[PDB]
Design a binder for these strands. Structure first.
Ligand SMILES: [Fe+2]
Ligand SMILES: [Zn+2]
Length: 349
RNA sequence: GUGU
């Protein structure tokens, strides 16, 4: 039993072309796409005003196609899961830092998270690495000045995600920039012939945060974008796949994986417990996470009886299935935090 | 990597 998953590199606002490409493959080969995974640079600009939050060179200050899907003019034909890259409507993603649908069939995984679909556990890490921002908190509501920093990956995602392969393996992990040093684990000589600009970076190319997460979780697959080129490599048991940008040949590939059972997009139980147990570090909605707390210390208080009660209350107030909600994004920010706070306090810890 |  087989499922076919499309994996996409950078989209840069070219959604109609991406779905056209994807519908072609469905018609040409007769295979059915279960769902789509995109590794970032999604540019989910709702309308003109969101352009202030898109950090691009001036020639790329363009709306793209997403507003068509946001308005309902277009309908995304497949469920599309994505992380954020360095070219985003960063204000929208911060409202949805705990994940959410930006429009029908288009689900943002958040700053980081794990989801369940078709028996698979999928971990996403948004953004790109800059050492000088990796300790900065998020400030909310988003203001135009943070356009330059909102999409930089924070070190704290390492502690949020590190326990996630205790119960079971991670099937797929996504990141926008490559895990640092993985460039050396494939045919880099051939890669340097197509991208001679990479050679000077050596093994330091890529994000150290993603390197750590890769080494800790060892997913079956790690997918990244951002470098506008195809690449493959193997780090121990992990198959690494880098993808190009929509418009070129190397932008889309497909994973044909065993389908254990067909199952709708669901929240991951272990992620949900991590989210509830770290609530104290996130409780100040003007600035989070409060790193005076230890994320690891907070997560060390997880127990099997608390996990069971957390998932019971999550199913009650939110539900295990991830379902489309068309409230505005600032309301979704407040609502999801309202139930995390409520669930935590009901634990009396 | 259209990366500061
Ligand atoms: Fe990028
Ligand atoms: Zn890109």
């Amino acid at each position: 039993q087989i499922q076919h998953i499309a994996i996409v590199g950078c989209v840069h606002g070219k959604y109609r072309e991406m779905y056209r490409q994807l519908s072609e493959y469905e018609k040409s080969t007769g295979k059915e796409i279960s769902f789509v995974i995109c590794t970032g640079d999604m540019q989910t600009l709702r309308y003109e005003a969101d352009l202030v939050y898109l950090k691009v060179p001036p020639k790329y200050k363009q709306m793209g196609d997403f507003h068509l899907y946001y308005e309902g003019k277009e309908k995304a034909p497949y469920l599309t899961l994505f992380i954020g890259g360095n070219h985003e409507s960063s204000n929208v993603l911060l409202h949805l830092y705990n994940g959410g649908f930006v429009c029908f069939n288009m689900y943002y995984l958040g700053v980081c998270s794990c989801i369940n679909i078709n028996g698979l556990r999928i971990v996403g890490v948004s953004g790109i690495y800059k050492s000088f921002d990796e300790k900065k908190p998020y400030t909310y509501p988003p203001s135009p000045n943070d356009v330059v920093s909102l999409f930089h990956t924070r070190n704290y995602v390492i502690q949020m995600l590190s326990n996630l392969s205790q119960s079971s393996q991670i099937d797929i992990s996504l990141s926008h920039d490559w895990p640092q040093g993985i460039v050396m684990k494939g045919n880099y000589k051939q890669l340097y012939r197509f991208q001679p600009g990479f050679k000077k970076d050596g093994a330091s190319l890529g994000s150290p945060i993603n390197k750590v997460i890769l080494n800790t979780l060892k997913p079956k697959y790690w997918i990244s974008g951002h470098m506008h080129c195809e690449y493959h490599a193997e780090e121990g048991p992990t198959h690494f796949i880098a993808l190009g940008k929509i418009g070129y040949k190397n932008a889309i590939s497909y994973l044909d994986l065993p389908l254990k059972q067909k199952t709708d997009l669901e929240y991951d139980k272990d992620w949900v417990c991590n989210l509830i147990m770290t609530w104290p570090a996130f409780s100040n909605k003007a600035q989070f996470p409060d790193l005076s707390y230890s994320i690891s210390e907070l997560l060390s208080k997880r127990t099997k009886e608390l996990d069971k009660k957390i998932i019971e209350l999550w199913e009650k107030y939110i539900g295990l299935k991830i379902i489309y909600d068309s409230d505005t994004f600032d309301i979704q920010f407040t609502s999801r935090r309202f139930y995390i706070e409520k669930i935590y306090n009901e634990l009396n810890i």
